[PDB]
Design a protein around this ligand. Structure first.
Ligand SMILES: COc1cc2ncn(-c3cc(O[C@H](C)c4ccccc4Cl)c(C(N)=O)s3)c2cc1OC
Lengths: 291, 257
């Protein structure tokens, strides 16, 4: 711990504080996550550490070290230049170019396919948890809510806007599909510059999803009318033409997005399968313009 | 979703080798024995029931204990402290929300203090180098259960029952990887309930033939047959519940052919 120089605060929350820091001996720039620390090591830190240690992939943020004193606990991460949320705002006037959207989605799916095939669910995929550098990389971050699904993970979380319909309807278990739902929402947000389903509440969130994608029935999604939080009195909305939901997308993007937003979590495309979608046939690695 | 099952299985098969304890560790522990370990694990089972924790939690805790005892000498009076800390860690990893520390001190019957449990937690984490996501028999059974034709809750509960029994006896079960014990537990449960055998699809998926499972199957059959006469009874009592279809009351077959 004496080898690190604090440069500046980069975040704060219930966990503790996050600092940009420098290694005094090697010069390495790092993100220091400091956990306050009589309840012991927090459950989220136990999970975040043991899961990330297993996950070495170029599109997942590296845990560089864990320093465990008697009364403080530090998580040392590689440092990236900003989050997608901050990038999307900077891009509000100009837009993010479509080849860069494609590159980002492609890399996000690679990181996620890696997580999923290593039995880790992320569960909290949102623009501010995705980190970018100036050389065109995007990486999943904040595995504070991540879970190993060697056995199925029961439902308790994730911010509302990116929450899958099956969770809102009160399914018993999570599945990999919840993460794909989140990426699909983020994909559309990059394209339109607007949150796809920005709800005030759980019920407003469902209703926004329904108004766009159609109110699901037993044909579309078997078992749906039997789910704990389904109501017969739900309004029955028509599905909307995707050319009106994400106008600047070609046929291939609309295809992928609708498969990512598929109602039935059993038939919602996987990250693995999404990587082979004709949408990524001409994927390149463009460099973003960061402020 | 079907896509990831193979990659996950392959990964767990890889991870179970890295997360295995040393097989002859108990011989190198001057003050503790297999018998004491059996008492401890049986107690943890009770703890699991009393606090309504998942079976996965129990399995993970045992893995942590066995790994910890693979590199640290422990005196008999401190074994339960290692046990409690492992259970607490397992809870923190696996449970939606774990019981608070005070509840874990309560079950020791005031033997150790809060401070002691938390320091042991720190120590176990240090010794295990934070590697807590260990593959378990439970995980493999879960994977294997998808190859049932069709699914049978009696089979599942009995497989779970036999797998849990394997946790009690370090001799012989430390000799076997979780994927192997699960292989045996699955076939034995399948054979007892339905008369079917370790299915072709699992042979292809796991690479294990029925023949290759034989040594472990012979041990597990013996455990199963002798279960009512074992000193440790918590698991049998657990599996009398209708929750698990009272499978621990099912008569085991006399031979395996
Ligand atoms: C430039 O702004 C950055 C850079 C950066 N490089 C690494 N990180 C990480 C922080 C972190 O933990 C905290 C809890 C976190 C995660 C996601 C979003 C915000 C915050 Cl504060 C990482 C992790 N847990 O994987 S990686 C950052 C953060 C950052 O601005 C927040």
């Amino acid at each position: 711990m004496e080898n690190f120089q604090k440069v500046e605060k980069i975040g704060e929350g219930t966990y503790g504080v996050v600092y940009k820091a420098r290694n005094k001996l090697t010069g390495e720039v790092v993100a220091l996550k400091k956990i306050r620390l009589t309840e012991g090591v927090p459950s989220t830190a136990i999970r975040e550490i043991s899961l990330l240690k297993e996950l070495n992939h170029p599109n997942i943020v590296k845990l560089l070290d864990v320093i465990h004193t008697e009364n403080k606990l530090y998580l040392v991460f590689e440092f990236l230049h900003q989050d997608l949320k901050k990038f999307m705002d900077a891009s509000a006037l100009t837009g993010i170019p479509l080849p860069l959207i494609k590159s980002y989605l492609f890399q996000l799916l690679q990181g996620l396919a890696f997580c999923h095939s290593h039995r880790v669910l992320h569960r909290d995929l949102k623009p501010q948890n995705l980190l970018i550098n100036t050389e065109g990389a995007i990486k999943l971050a904040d595995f504070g809510l991540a879970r190993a699904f060697g056995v199925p993970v029961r439902t308790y979380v994730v911010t509302l806007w990116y929450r899958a319909p099956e969770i809102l309807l009160g399914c018993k278990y999570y599945s990999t599909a919840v993460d794909i739902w989140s990426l699909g929402c983020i994909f559309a947000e990059m394209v339109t510059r607007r949150a796809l389903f920005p709800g005030d509440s759980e019920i407003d969130q469902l209703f926004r999803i329904f108004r766009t994608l159609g109110t699901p029935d037993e044909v579309v999604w078997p078992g749906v009318t039997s789910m704990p939080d389904y109501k017969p009195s739900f309004p029955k909305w028509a599905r909307q033409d995707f050319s009106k939901v994400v106008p600047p997308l070609d046929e291939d993007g609309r295809s992928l997005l609708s498969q990512m937003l598929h109602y039935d979590p059993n038939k919602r495309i996987s990250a693995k399968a999404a990587l082979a979608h004709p949408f990524f046939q001409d994927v390149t690695k463009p460099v973003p313009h960061l402020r | 979703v079907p896509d990831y099952h193979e990659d996950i299985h392959t990964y767990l098969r890889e991870m179970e080798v890295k997360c295995k304890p040393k097989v002859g560790y108990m011989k190198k522990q001057p003050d503790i024995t297999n018998s004491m370990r059996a008492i401890l694990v049986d107690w943890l089972v009770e703890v699991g029931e009393e606090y309504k924790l998942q079976n996965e939690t129990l399995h993970l805790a045992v893995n942590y204990i066995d790994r910890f005892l693979s590199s640290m000498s422990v005196l008999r009076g401190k074994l339960q402290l290692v046990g409690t800390a492992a259970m607490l860690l397992a809870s923190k990893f696996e449970e939606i929300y774990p019981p608070e520390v005070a509840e874990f001190v309560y079950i020791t019957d005031d033997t150790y203090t809060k401070k002691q449990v938390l320091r042991m937690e720190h120590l176990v984490l240090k010794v295990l180098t934070f590697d807590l996501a260990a593959p378990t028999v439970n995980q493999f059974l879960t994977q294997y259960f998808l190859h049932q034709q069709p699914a049978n809750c009696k089979v599942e509960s009995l497989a779970m029952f036999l797998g849990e029994l394997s946790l009690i006896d370090a001799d012989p079960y430390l000799k076997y990887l979780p994927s192997v014990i699960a292989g045996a537990a699955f076939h034995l449960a399948l054979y007892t309930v339905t008369g079917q055998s370790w299915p072709e699809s699992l042979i292809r998926k796991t690479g294990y033939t029925l023949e290759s499972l034989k040594p472990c199957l012979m041990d597990l059959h013996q455990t199963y047959l002798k279960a009512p006469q074992h000193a440790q009874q918590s698991i049998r009592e657990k599996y009398k519940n209708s929750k698990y279809h009272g499978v621990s009351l099912l008569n085991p077959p006399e031979t395996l052919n």
